[PDB]
Amino acid sequence: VQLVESGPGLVQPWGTLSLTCRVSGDSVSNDNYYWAWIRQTPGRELQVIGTIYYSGTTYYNPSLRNRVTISLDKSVNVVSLRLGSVSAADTAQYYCVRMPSHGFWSTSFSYWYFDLWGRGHFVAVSWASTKGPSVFPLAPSSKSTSGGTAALGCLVKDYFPEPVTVSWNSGALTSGVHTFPAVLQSSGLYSLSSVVTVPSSSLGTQTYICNVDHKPSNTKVDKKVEPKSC
Amino acid sequence: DIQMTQSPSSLSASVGDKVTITCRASQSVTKYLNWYQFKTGQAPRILIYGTYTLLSGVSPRFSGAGSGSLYTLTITNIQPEDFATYYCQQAHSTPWTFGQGTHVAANRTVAAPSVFIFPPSDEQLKSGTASVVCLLNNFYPREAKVQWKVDNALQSGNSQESVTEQDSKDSTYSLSSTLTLSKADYEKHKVYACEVTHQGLSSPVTKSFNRGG
Amino acid sequence: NWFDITNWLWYIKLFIMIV
Ligand SMILES: CCCCCCCCCCCCOP(=O)([O-])OCC[N+](C)(C)C
Ligand SMILES: *[C@@H]1O[C@H](CO)[C@@H](O)[C@H](O)[C@H]1NC(C)=O
């Protein structure tokens, strides 16, 4: 059973924001399960936006009830969430969730718990428009070397909205990688760095490419990082 | 809405220790109390429902207890895969509500950071600004002081800091201090230096270069 | 809504199980 959420990265204020969750294990009309939408705001607070059932019945959190709708699309096995009149305070990670419906004679009747969660999908709500990042190499030198290992990276600067995804050598290099959280610059754009430590002996034989992705602006960038020889 | 509060908000523990997390509610929730595990990298994961019941595939180190308005999650022999943030949720009332979360991090032996410095990329000088990066790799504890010095003068708000989350296996942190400047100012001065103070260093560690060579 | 109803239904069910 797999739960893949998807939707837009950035939504304009006063717009309506729609997300879809593809359920890859069993049918949403299984009627042993309810399905639900739960969101986490920046600041770690967990809010349960809504609950839905194969029969059509929905529950909506009162503070949102005036402007939210959940529905099932049985033919493709997806569950949809629409949230209208959206403001800055709706910027959040949106999780799709499954909830056992225990029947009257079940040992665990009236016990309501969220037993399976999707990976989430982040949605920023802002008047500001999308803007892709610039990628600059952080080349190794004698000054970014400590002992037998050298450090290198690439700076992903000036982008909006979050997030950016960074990989090294197309996923084959995943040992000692540190891609930092973003920081909000004065300009109102985001920037981070991604750095890896490798054995210094491996420069001049192994190529190191960093692969940046920014789906809100359809940005893909491959930057090659060459040793400097200080 | 039933308000939920966990204690402590954050804690840290050595591998093997017993860890108890307390969840108090504004009303009585009559044992309709669920516990969830949140780790970066994976999808959120339930571990307990209805105070006591473990779900399949959850290790029996986790155990739930409580009644009335007061419940408690217990990690018996805490393991590397258990370091995470835990949430309690009430199913008693119509709008389901979570706690604020308890972050459980690792205790570890002191580890000094390796310090690296990066001057700005030629491409970026072409763009018209200049960022210089100081990297502090694989250290513990989290507290570290990073000062920038340009020709021996200390900087203001020119730089920003960022800190990774604790490494799953290393149990250590890394930190980037990026100092951003106009190309003008960067071309003005010569000697750019990054000074680091941290426990498990005896003397402050400085990394510096001369602009150009 | 139905959720809150199950809260009481549990006690109803207990009343039944006793007999
Ligand atoms: C008409 C029926 C008469 C019932 C009168 C009320 C007294 C019955 C006491 C029964 C106590 C058993 O529940 P408990 O284990 O203590 O905790 C609550 C367990 N649930 C969360 C599943 C509900
Ligand atoms: C880690 O354990 C040592 C051993 O007693 C203790 O002194 C120290 O305070 C602990 N650190 C934290 C952050 O709890």
Residue numbers in the entry:
A (entry chain B): 2 to 35, 35A, 35B, 36 to 82, 82A, 82B, 82C, 83 to 100, ...
B (entry chain A): 1 to 213
C (entry chain C): 671 to 689
Can you list sentences taken from the study reporting this PDB entry?
The membrane-proximal external region (MPER) of the HIV-1 gp41 fusion protein is targeted by the most broadly reactive HIV-1 neutralizing antibodies. Here, we examine the structural and molecular mechansims of neutralization by anti-MPER bnAb, LN01, which was isolated from lymph-node-derived germinal center B cells of an elite controller and exhibits broad neutralization breadth. LN01 engages both MPER and the transmembrane (TM) region, which together form a continuous helix in complex with LN01. The tilted TM orientation allows LN01 to interact simultaneously with the peptidic component of the MPER epitope and membrane via two specific lipid binding sites of the antibody paratope.
Crystal structures of LN01 were determined in complex with MPER-TM1, in complex with MPER-TM1 and phosphatidylserine (06:0 PS), and in complex with MPER-TM2 to resolutions of 3.2 Å, 3.1 Å, and 3.9 Å, respectively. Co-crystallization of MPER-TM1-LN01 with 06:0 phosphatidylserine (PS) revealed a network of polar interactions coordinating one PS molecule. HCDR3 S97 and HCDR2 Y52 hydrogen bond to the carbonyl of PS, HCDR1 D32 contacts the amide of PS, the amide of HCDR3 F100 hydrogen bonds to the phosphate group of PS, and HCDR3 W100a to the carbonyl of the acyl chain. This interaction network reveals how lipid interaction coordinates the HCDR3 extended conformation, allowing W100a immersion into the lipid bilayer. Notably, most residues coordinating epitope recognition, Fos-Choline-12, and PS interaction in LN01 are present in the LN01 UCA. LN01 gH/sL binds with a KD of 6.2 ± 0.02 nM but shows no or lower potency in neutralization in agreement with the importance of HCDR1 D32 and HCDR2 Y52 for PS coordination.
